[PDB]
Symmetry: C3
Subunit: 260 residues, 3 copies
């Protein structure tokens, strides 16, 4: 709330944030720990989302080094403090609130006024896979490997990953992936629609930059209104969706006419 987290605050939580005009880049920045995630990292992610400047309309998430994220830092299942905050294992209404605070680090990636992109190389495991899933678009390196590992550890996926997983691959494949907890390669991810594009590792940065340029070339207000429409389409009946579309078009035509 109020002020954005500082670069120093973010560095202590394992993140870097750079903003250039309409594009924000968030980098997981603990390569020696394979970008293992902590509670503090998730709650700072939430803080970044709540305080981004209004002009930002694209958010790119990637990892420093060859691994996107190994998932949750195993110290989070020990008694003490991790990154200065108490672990779940320490702590049920209070645990419920902490988990809800962590989920807020992922939920904002669906906001209609941003397009979020995960640029994934190497392993995205567990919480790492759920971070990539929470983004609108995934661009994978040919090195990428994805795994919903939580059930293998006796846990469920609780960082908002279940819904996008089922939307991408269907409930049946989702069951297979989660209940085997198996690791899939980038070719398989592409086949299952988990990646919107797979490119050679050397080309991942250029592929993300090409997609950013394509998005910036579409006007901001139409992009936002259209994303808002698409997120409602699945759950609406057709008659309702047609009304919602029509309502949105009136606002576009209004803005365009006042503009000229």
């Amino acid at each position: 709330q109020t002020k954005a987290p500082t670069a120093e605050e973010l560095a202590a939580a394992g993140l870097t944030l750079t903003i250039d005009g309409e594009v924000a880049r968030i980098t997981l920045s603990r390569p020696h720990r394979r970008n293992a995630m902590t509670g503090r990292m998730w709650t700072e992610l939430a803080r970044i989302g709540h305080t981004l400047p209004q002009a930002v309309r694209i958010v790119v998430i990637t990892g420093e080094g060859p691994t996107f994220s190994s998932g949750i830092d195993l110290d989070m299942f020990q008694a003490g403090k991790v990154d200065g905050e108490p672990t779940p294992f320490t702590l049920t209404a209070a645990l419920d609130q902490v988990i809800a605070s962590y989920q807020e680090g992922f939920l904002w990636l669906r906001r209609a006024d941003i397009v979020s992109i995960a640029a994934v190389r190497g392993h995205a495991i567990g919480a790492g896979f759920q971070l990539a899933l929470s983004c609108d678009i995934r661009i994978l390196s040919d090195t990428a490997q994805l795994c919903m590992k939580e059930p293998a550890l006796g846990l469920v996926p609780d960082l908002t990953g279940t819904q996008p997983l089922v939307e991408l691959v269907g409930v049946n494949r989702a069951i297979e992936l989660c209940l085997t907890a198996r690791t899939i390669d980038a070719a398989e991810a592409a086949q299952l629609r988990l990646a919107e594009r797979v490119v050679a590792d050397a080309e991942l940065d250029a592929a993300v930059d090409a997609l950013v340029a394509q998005l910036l070339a579409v006007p901001a207000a139409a992009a936002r209104a259209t994303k808002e429409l698409l997120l409602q389409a699945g759950r609406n009946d057709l008659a309702t969706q047609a009304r919602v579309e029509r309502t949105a078009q009136l606002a576009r035509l209004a803005e365009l006419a006042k503009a000229s």
Copy 2:
């Protein structure tokens, strides 16, 4: 209402309609304008749907010439009359009603008692893509190119395209396609499930005729009842869908027994 539009009325709106027994063929018929669509064309499409004879159970939509449709005629964004009716730009409750009248040209393609097929060659852009999306089945030529262009023009898709797009390719890919407004080729369309079949251009008419023959070989009442069931499946819980299926089967068994 009451009488079907005449061939002369349809020709002035850029359409041809031929009916042979149980099959109706609607052709966009302005090849020199790349079958660009107008308000009058949409409201005549709605009139065709409301007055088709009861025996028609299949509807095939294609374009005259090498382009299915370039989308909305740019004159629709000018002050005057297009095809004899006032433009949106001329005109908000009244604009809401006009848009709703245009949507009715697309909505009826989902009726349970028809199977609608879009046979697409060359470009289907914007309103043209939404027409193809509104059909049950798309058969593409290898020449086909699809593009949701509206956001690039500062507009949203409001001709009922959002829901089938999300059902076909998933919300994530839908965001990518709409917010980049990019053009996809037929091979990509096939990969994304946007086309049920892609064939050589010379073979498009034969492919449509083969599919028509397959549909006609299934009895009309079972086809209708089954389409009605499938359209309800996504939004129902499993227990409810099983009840709906069972209810439909009682009616089939009834009709079959009275038949014999």
Copy 3:
């Protein structure tokens, strides 16, 4: 209710059931009749599901011989008794109840505490295809052929197949498959996501055993909780699904802590 059906009772209904520890194997066992299904078979399937021991968490369904199932036994459309019970043709509230009893043979395959696998070779037609569809996972032999034949016979699919079909292939493809009643091969099934894996016929048993081993290696309670979450994901809004996930995680953390 109460006691499980005996092996003798099951054999008279065309089924075999073997249980080994956490894995139950149900085999359609009328190869000379291409495992054609009857009312008695469906209601025994329901009885198996209602009485399986608590320790069973995986259920494998396959056919004896080269055909999974030719679908409904044509005698079910004749006047008399089939397998000792009266046919639908004999018999509307009473017919409604009989059909609902048959559906219960398929519905239990979605229970959260089991993973159900259909191992399909040769033809799975009509009721046979709906049995395979009702399972969480399908592994196909390269010999497999699938067909939703009901509409061709003047019927609808009423054994709970419509919803999984639409979830797998999308409503549009579902319409095409059901309203043409056409037969698809295993390569096509794989392309359409109807099969989670296709393997050489000689390798089908090993492929199923590999998947079973993968499932058994994930703890039972996390598997169950995760399947329960995934089945709710499609119909929930994102905020609701995040709450459901969080609720499930509290129970996991509880059980794990009491465990240690």
